Amino acid sequence: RQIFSEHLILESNRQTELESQLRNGKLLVKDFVRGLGKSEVFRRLVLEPNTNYRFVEICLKRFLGREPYNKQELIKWSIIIAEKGYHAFIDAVVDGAEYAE
Amino acid sequence: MNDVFTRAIAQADLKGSFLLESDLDKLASFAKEGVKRLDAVAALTNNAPAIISDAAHKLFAEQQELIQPGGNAYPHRRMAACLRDMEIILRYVSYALLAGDASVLDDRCLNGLRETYNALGTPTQSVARAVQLMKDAAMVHLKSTANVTVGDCSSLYSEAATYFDKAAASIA
Amino acid sequence: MNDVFTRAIAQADLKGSFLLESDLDKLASFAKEGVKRLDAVAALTNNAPAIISDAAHKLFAEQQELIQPGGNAYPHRRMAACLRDMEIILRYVSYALLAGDASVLDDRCLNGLRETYNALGTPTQSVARAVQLMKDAAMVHLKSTANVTVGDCSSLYSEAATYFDKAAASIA
Amino acid sequence: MNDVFTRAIAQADLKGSFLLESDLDKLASFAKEGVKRLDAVAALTNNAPAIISDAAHKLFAEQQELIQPGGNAYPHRRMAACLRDMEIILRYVSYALLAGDASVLDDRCLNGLRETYNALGTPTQSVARAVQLMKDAAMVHLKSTANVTVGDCSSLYSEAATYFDKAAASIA
Amino acid sequence: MNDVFTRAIAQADLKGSFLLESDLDKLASFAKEGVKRLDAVAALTNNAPAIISDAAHKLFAEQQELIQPGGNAYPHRRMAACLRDMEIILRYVSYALLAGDASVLDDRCLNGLRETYNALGTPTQSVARAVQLMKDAAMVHLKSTANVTVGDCSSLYSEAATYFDKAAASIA
Amino acid sequence: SRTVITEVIATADSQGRFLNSTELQAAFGRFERAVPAIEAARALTKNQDALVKGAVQAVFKKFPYVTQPGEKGYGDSNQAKCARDIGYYLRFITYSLVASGTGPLDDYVIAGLREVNRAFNLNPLWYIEALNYIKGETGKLLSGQSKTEALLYIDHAINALS
Amino acid sequence: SRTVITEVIATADSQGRFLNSTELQAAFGRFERAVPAIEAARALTKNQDALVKGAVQAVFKKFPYVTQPGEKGYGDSNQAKCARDIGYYLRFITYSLVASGTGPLDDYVIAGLREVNRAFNLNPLWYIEALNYIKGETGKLLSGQSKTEALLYIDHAINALS
Amino acid sequence: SRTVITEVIATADSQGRFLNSTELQAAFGRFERAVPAIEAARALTKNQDALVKGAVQAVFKKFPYVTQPGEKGYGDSNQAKCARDIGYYLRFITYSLVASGTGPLDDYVIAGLREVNRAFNLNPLWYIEALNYIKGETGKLLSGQSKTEALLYIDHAINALS
Amino acid sequence: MSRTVITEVIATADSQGRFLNSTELQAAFGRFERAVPAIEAARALTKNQDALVKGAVQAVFKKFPYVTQPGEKGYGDSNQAKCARDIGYYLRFITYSLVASGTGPLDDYVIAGLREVNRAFNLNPLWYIEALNYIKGETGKLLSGQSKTEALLYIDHAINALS
Amino acid sequence: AITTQGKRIYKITVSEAGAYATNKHRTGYRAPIRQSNYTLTVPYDRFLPEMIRLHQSGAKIVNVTSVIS
Ligand SMILES: CCC1=C(C)/C(=C/C2=NC(=C\c3[nH]c(/C=C4\NC(=O)[C@H](C)[C@H]4CC)c(C)c3CCC(=O)O)/C(CCC(=O)O)=C2C)NC1=O
Ligand SMILES: CCC1=C(C)/C(=C/C2=NC(=C\c3[nH]c(/C=C4\NC(=O)[C@H](C)[C@H]4CC)c(C)c3CCC(=O)O)/C(CCC(=O)O)=C2C)NC1=O
Ligand SMILES: CCC1=C(C)/C(=C/C2=NC(=C\c3[nH]c(/C=C4\NC(=O)[C@H](C)[C@H]4CC)c(C)c3CCC(=O)O)/C(CCC(=O)O)=C2C)NC1=O
Ligand SMILES: CCC1=C(C)/C(=C/C2=NC(=C\c3[nH]c(/C=C4\NC(=O)[C@H](C)[C@H]4CC)c(C)c3CCC(=O)O)/C(CCC(=O)O)=C2C)NC1=O
Ligand SMILES: CCC1=C(C)/C(=C/C2=NC(=C\c3[nH]c(/C=C4\NC(=O)[C@H](C)[C@H]4CC)c(C)c3CCC(=O)O)/C(CCC(=O)O)=C2C)NC1=O
Ligand SMILES: CCC1=C(C)/C(=C/C2=NC(=C\c3[nH]c(/C=C4\NC(=O)[C@H](C)[C@H]4CC)c(C)c3CCC(=O)O)/C(CCC(=O)O)=C2C)NC1=O
Ligand SMILES: CCC1=C(C)/C(=C/C2=NC(=C\c3[nH]c(/C=C4\NC(=O)[C@H](C)[C@H]4CC)c(C)c3CCC(=O)O)/C(CCC(=O)O)=C2C)NC1=O
Ligand SMILES: CCC1=C(C)/C(=C/C2=NC(=C\c3[nH]c(/C=C4\NC(=O)[C@H](C)[C@H]4CC)c(C)c3CCC(=O)O)/C(CCC(=O)O)=C2C)NC1=O
Ligand SMILES: CCC1=C(C)/C(=C/C2=NC(=C\c3[nH]c(/C=C4\NC(=O)[C@H](C)[C@H]4CC)c(C)c3CCC(=O)O)/C(CCC(=O)O)=C2C)NC1=O
Ligand SMILES: CCC1=C(C)/C(=C/C2=NC(=C\c3[nH]c(/C=C4\NC(=O)[C@H](C)[C@H]4CC)c(C)c3CCC(=O)O)/C(CCC(=O)O)=C2C)NC1=O
Ligand SMILES: CCC1=C(C)/C(=C/C2=NC(=C\c3[nH]c(/C=C4\NC(=O)[C@H](C)[C@H]4CC)c(C)c3CCC(=O)O)/C(CCC(=O)O)=C2C)NC1=O
Ligand SMILES: CCC1=C(C)/C(=C/C2=NC(=C\c3[nH]c(/C=C4\NC(=O)[C@H](C)[C@H]4CC)c(C)c3CCC(=O)O)/C(CCC(=O)O)=C2C)NC1=O
């Protein structure tokens, strides 16, 4: 619900590998969140419709829990996507200082 | 993200009907020329450093005010950002050339880029000029007859020109 | 996680020299049979729920104490867990059969499954029995010549047998 | 993390039968005396800070080596940590009191606290002694019947003694 | 993660008394030659790539089994790890030199390096010989009296040699 | 949707790299397989009416009781919706054939299938029976390789339902 | 123990690069300046006992009910351990003066100050007064750089108290 | 390492699903390029001995100043290192052609390339033009599918170098 | 937005949500003492800018003869001019860093994006390393005592980042 | 993570003994406190950053094992 927004909670969207790893205890919550971000459903349902900047806004609201400070933050974050993939964007967000704090 | 096949499928589904035999024939012709399309895409991919370097040299010969102190490409970070932007746009053009539809290029690259450049103070006309220079330096490479079978790739050349012009018109 | 071709390449790298001609012919002979291996893996995938259903029916016909209260697969969630384990075992075995290398199956699926069942109290012999039941069902579905051309695939069936046997022995 | 009702249901499911009328009778006997248990737990909760202050004062009194430098309880932050440990173990005993089962005690922290205190180096018999003496201090408050209607409280005292001593024996 | 001054204060806390004036004299002398050790640390940081390059060159010259296929640093990304590890080790040694205590060295990654190199299969004797090689190179680099004022620094050299040898003995 | 080309491009775009040789090999495989798939799509498009009507009738045969009063199959409207749904499944199978990927099915049909079937109490077994009928008649209508493609997609739909 | 040089090492270790100029030259400021700080540490060592007693009776003075029976002040051994605690605080002041940083103070005494204060009904105001008294003495005992060395740590201690 | 079917299994494993029409079509397109890439690797392995010498000589031709003393190119052991580098590149190109994917060349050469070339002070343009010479000579050794596979892989290595 | 002593102090105080403690103002005092040799060095280095740049250009050409012949990067009057301009840039940012008492000007204006620009334009880092080594040699004479060390720290930092 | 290096996961046994406890007592607890010893599985790509985080955070690791190979 925090990542996929409760309307994508469908049996087709259900990451079962991540869930089983979590249930084992071999997966951290940070890694479960990251794996949900780095998933086909998150790219196809969230990244593809939106531009890099609106996708950054969504990811800041959902992963950090806070809306972007201004449009310049959208701009500075969108370059990670544009140049290294939204996988590198998600890794930067979830392995950042703010998420860890 | 759409290619030609998914574009046809989506339009047919909006009409709520199967694909007509004309549409299937069009897609068959597309698939038949797909090998030439792959050749052009590989030419663009393998020559990305050459294309970017030539476009940069030409652009900074034409527009010296970029590389002057107080210009928009003056320090090393700004020059590296310039070259990075050119590489990214070339990447999305090659994606759109493989797919056959400019939907990926417009959706993922150009959809809000002019607003970004205005917010950054970047001359959008200079970015468009760099994109046209990459067009020239690329069609130099797409037309390289050597090492491949000879044939009529005029349609692919027109398609690549349209994608580059779409990029330039979107940024500026 | 490798395919057999990567195994040969890595061995060549370890011994420093190129691939011998014997190795190259072995790899080419495997590869020309690849369009013949695709039908086998497609037969495993297209019939996967049927294989799982029949294997579960036979497995729970053989042993009732599991379904019985106090048994390992008595609670409804634990029955679902049983079903999902059979599913994943079959899926990763099909992965390995396609790859022609059994290392993927050990590296990603079978690495710590035995220890997981040791920690969870599940009898490993029952999982081995389930894997062998899926062995039988998979062979049945693989032999079906309907909708495919006739041919001699003894290598494929024997390889699938070895893969399922290794998985079953690994679990217990 | 189990309740007396939860434990009864667990055994009933294990034997596969319904809940026997004797088990229901004992659950009803427990439930009719619920306000007993709630008043004890609530008084313990309300008077916990005074209990912990008294416990700290005495454990400083009889045990002296800690308070001077070099002991496993000199520093001020280490004092905050010790107060937190005594508070949380008192709270866990309160949990076991309300639930009526020690599984809420044994499973959660007692398992790991053993190796934790072995690794830290702080003596465990001192911890058990502090548990017993804080039990006495809390029991003194638990006697207080004022502001509340009078009644019997022996069974709750026996259960609390069992749980405190169980925690001490686990730690020791 | 404790400085020599912090370490001395830690023993003062352990004794629970003040710092004796003799220890104060030692610490004042340490802060007096702090200029000298800062120059040493600057000479270590500024010439870090040169030291690492010389150490790598002669380490690979002396031991050929690593570069060759199947060697611990053959795949051309394992040498990435080799050079990165050597740089990290010299960063830690510079940290220790500035702090004047090995506690900052022990706390961060001396404990884990041994077991990580055990798990990876990296031989520790090669790493230790590399540490001696960087020790010799850094000794030579810091000996350079040019561009700096002349003075007595044998104490610093002994400290640095002890730190490098201690790191190598820890990994080996 | 999700085709070979789209997976290639999206995988490149998620690592932020240019399309390299392996991606172009996959695209080449798609472009070579396009001919049998388009042939299969044309075959299933020509005979859509016979396939849909026969599938509906096979569904009714397997479950006669559904067409009884008070059940889902009674009434002209419900059987018209039956024919409509089988037409949807056939349309998306042909779309997946042309696209050379299960993307059209995974997006249009399979995404949200369980929720919708459980909400309207539609038995998946009806649709599996209809798809099995389509599977059977594809063998007659299609020979050789286009049959294999159509069967791959119909099997994917069936496994999605069951 | 977050001392300035150790903080340098940490804030470089979290990153992948060596100690740059700012770090080295801040260490240089410390290495020049340590002499007045350690001088003030030894000076406060020489005057420990007088500061201990004087602060004890100063806190006795401005808050009279402590002198009154029925409070924490009442009790001979109580007052003895009160003097022991103020001696702890002066020892930590000397520790911080030696360390050229606020690390030793925050390591032991400030860390979890409010929790222990509440648990033992020892509000910070009494210690605030004691440290104001000790600051008044350090105002006359030490002059020059060492005066500032004493005053800054005394102020950090009182700010942590308040 | 990585191949085409390796990427297929990786994608399917990530999505937690069985191999579909897209993935098996990619595997088919990979197995169709099996034997032409095999013959390309065969041809490059046959001639390697002349290519390595020609490559180091073309390197010296492109950078005459390197050969003179006081530079990297001067020294017989340096000559052997040049030959070994060229042999490594050609060997991994053959491995990649056998594997039908740029994986072995990615993990055996490209991974860690820039920082090694910087740390050992090896100029990448040397290898860029050495691979350019190897490209020129593969232009004549082979023709057909094998030649274009060799061209793609060599060009990928070249773009990696720059 | 540079990373200087004062600004690193302010940033590490802000991140912890606290006022500037003793040690922060303490390091700031160290910096304000540092500044006098730094400004002296920057003055002595900005006065001699043209001779330094000229000597650096000539030294680079001497150490790299091959760049001078036809068909290379160094052939041509325009490439001469851009060599002089690049070395002037490096010198100007070294003086900036001296004044600011930090590597912020160099790390932001020159170092960040250095490798990408060099690679794209096929510029060899060794040219600028030799130019900066010449500048180091000359500022060995131009500067005395503290100022020489302060200038050499930043020239060494630039050289290390070039390598 | 597809390559051979993305393989070969590693298990790490971590204890949060007093070196971690001091720094966390200074900084403070944002979350409830857990047991000292735990087994944490990390891939090779994240192996180095994870150990850097563990060492900087002040924890002491008990034993490192190669789960794969
Ligand atoms: C922030 C500071 C800064 C630096 C350092 C900088 C370096 C720099 N030098 C450039 C041109 C150049 N610079 C040189 C330098 C060479 N000339 C030869 O005489 C020497 C051997 C050698 C110098 C030692 C050359 C050859 C070029 C032309 C490269 C080309 O365009 O192909 C360019 C490309 C802009 C153009 O085409 O004019 C940059 C970005 N730019 C900056 O904004
Ligand atoms: C995939 C879609 C996409 C693209 C392409 C994109 C480009 C982009 N260009 C940027 C800045 C920039 N872009 C340029 C390039 C321009 N200025 C020069 O003069 C040239 C004339 C011209 C290039 C030909 C420069 C110099 C900057 C730096 C601005 C700055 O750092 O202040 C930035 C933000 C700054 C950063 O984080 O580094 C982005 C995000 N963003 C996107 O979401
Ligand atoms: C592994 C990745 C891959 C590559 C590298 C590739 C190249 C490639 N190009 C081919 C034919 C061709 N290639 C071209 C393209 C050329 N025409 C002009 O000369 C242009 C310079 C240039 C494109 C802009 C043409 C026109 C054909 C023949 C088309 C036909 O016969 O149908 C063929 C088939 C050989 C044949 O038709 O006899 C291949 C394999 N295909 C791939 O799947
Ligand atoms: C990497 C791929 C992967 C595999 C292979 C996998 C298997 C797996 N099955 C599990 C549970 C389980 N699995 C079973 C299966 C047994 N029941 C018996 O009927 C059968 C003989 C046997 C099935 C073959 C049971 C009973 C449990 C629950 C055990 C318990 O709760 O105590 C668990 C524990 C974690 C969880 O389910 O949340 C794993 C990891 N999980 C994965 O992510
Ligand atoms: C899109 C996915 C895809 C599949 C599924 C595929 C399979 C495939 N199987 C083929 C023939 C064959 N298929 C098989 C396999 C079957 N023979 C026996 O009945 C066994 C029961 C069974 C093996 C388990 C065999 C043995 C051949 C003949 C081998 C040959 O072509 O020489 C052929 C070549 C002739 C044709 O069908 O047009 C293909 C392309 N290719 C693909 O691109
Ligand atoms: C899961 C619930 C939980 C438990 C079980 C728990 C016990 C516990 N006590 C600890 C250390 C400690 N334990 C004690 C208490 C001992 N020393 C003396 O005072 C006494 C003899 C004795 C108490 C009666 C002290 C003082 C420390 C601090 C050690 C240090 O900071 O170095 C630690 C190490 C990490 C930390 O303190 O944050 C734990 C986990 N804490 C919890 O959050
Ligand atoms: C806000 C939460 C809450 C509390 C605090 C609570 C206390 C509480 N206990 C009651 C009954 C009672 N409660 C007790 C228990 C007391 N007898 C003594 O031994 C001890 C001081 C203590 C047990 C440790 C007794 C003896 C009764 C009379 C009913 C009976 O047990 O027969 C009553 C009903 C008063 C009446 O009889 O008219 C209340 C309000 N009830 C609540 O819902
Ligand atoms: C911020 C970094 C830093 C710099 C820039 C620096 C330069 C420097 N060197 C100095 C003296 C000195 N410099 C050294 C350096 C040693 N002498 C030998 O030649 C060795 C090769 C060499 C290093 C091991 C020594 C031993 C002294 C005299 C120490 C003393 O008398 O206290 C002084 C104090 C004298 C004055 O005020 O003019 C400074 C400022 N020192 C530093 O810590
Ligand atoms: C915080 C700092 C820290 C370090 C540096 C550390 C050591 C370390 N070395 C590693 C691999 C490696 N390290 C080396 C280097 C050694 N092997 C020999 O050949 C060289 C002479 C020698 C250089 C000192 C090599 C070759 C590997 C690759 C082994 C492999 O691929 O598994 C790895 C695996 C992570 C990765 O490579 O991405 C670690 C964590 N652990 C730490 O927590
Ligand atoms: C993307 C493709 C797609 C499909 C496949 C689809 C199926 C579908 N069929 C529906 C109605 C229905 N569909 C049927 C089908 C039954 N009729 C006969 O009896 C057979 C036994 C059986 C068919 C094999 C029936 C009975 C209803 C009416 C159910 C109701 O109104 O509650 C509905 C409810 C919405 C409405 O029409 O009001 C859906 C969503 N919808 C879609 O958008
Ligand atoms: C070095 C680490 C450390 C610190 C920081 C520390 C503070 C501290 N002071 C305490 C008691 C005390 N603190 C004071 C001081 C205050 N009370 C009166 O109101 C005075 C007016 C006022 C003095 C200005 C007194 C008098 C006590 C004795 C209370 C008692 O135990 O009876 C206690 C209770 C346990 C004990 O020490 O016996 C602690 C933990 N203790 C430590 O081991
Ligand atoms: C399997 C992956 C792999 C690659 C790619 C590889 C290249 C390579 N060649 C090296 C040595 C070297 N290689 C050369 C050759 C270059 N310099 C000139 O002679 C020529 C123009 C040019 C050759 C075209 C030289 C000179 C050295 C010595 C390093 C030095 O002098 O600084 C080194 C440094 C370690 C050593 O071998 O001693 C590497 C990493 N080694 C590998 O294990």
Author numbering:
A (entry chain 4): 52 to 152
B (entry chain k), C (entry chain i), D (entry chain g), E (entry chain h): 1 to 172
F (entry chain d), G (entry chain a), H (entry chain c): 2 to 163
I (entry chain b): 1 to 163
J (entry chain m): 10 to 78
Recite the paper's sentences.
Phycobilisomes (PBS) are antenna megacomplexes that transfer energy to photosystems II and I in thylakoids. Here we show the cryo-EM structure at a global resolution of 2.9 Å of the 5.9-MDa PBS from Anthocerotibacter panamensis (hereafter A. panamensis), a recently discovered Gloeobacterial species that diverged from Gloeobacter spp. around 1.4 billion years ago. The A. panamensis PBS features a configuration comprising two herein characterized linkers and presents a paddle-shaped morphology. The two-fold symmetric PBS contains twelve APC hexamers assembled as a heptacylindrical core surrounded by twelve PC hexamers, with approximate dimensions of 273 Å (width), 500 Å (height), and 129 Å (thickness).
The top and bottom AP cylinders also use different linkers to connect to PC hexamers. For the bottom pentacylindrical portion of the core, two common CpcG linkers tether the Rb and Rb’ PC hexamers to the A/A’ cylinders, whereas, at the top, an unusual combination of CpcJ and CpcN is used. Two CpcJ linkers connect four side PC hexamers (Rs1/Rs2 and Rs1’/Rs2’) to the D/D’ cylinders via the inter-domain linker. Although previous studies proposed CpcJ as a linker in Gv742128–30, our study is the first to demonstrate its function structurally. In contrast, the final resolution of PC hexamers ranged from 2.74 Å to 4.10 Å.
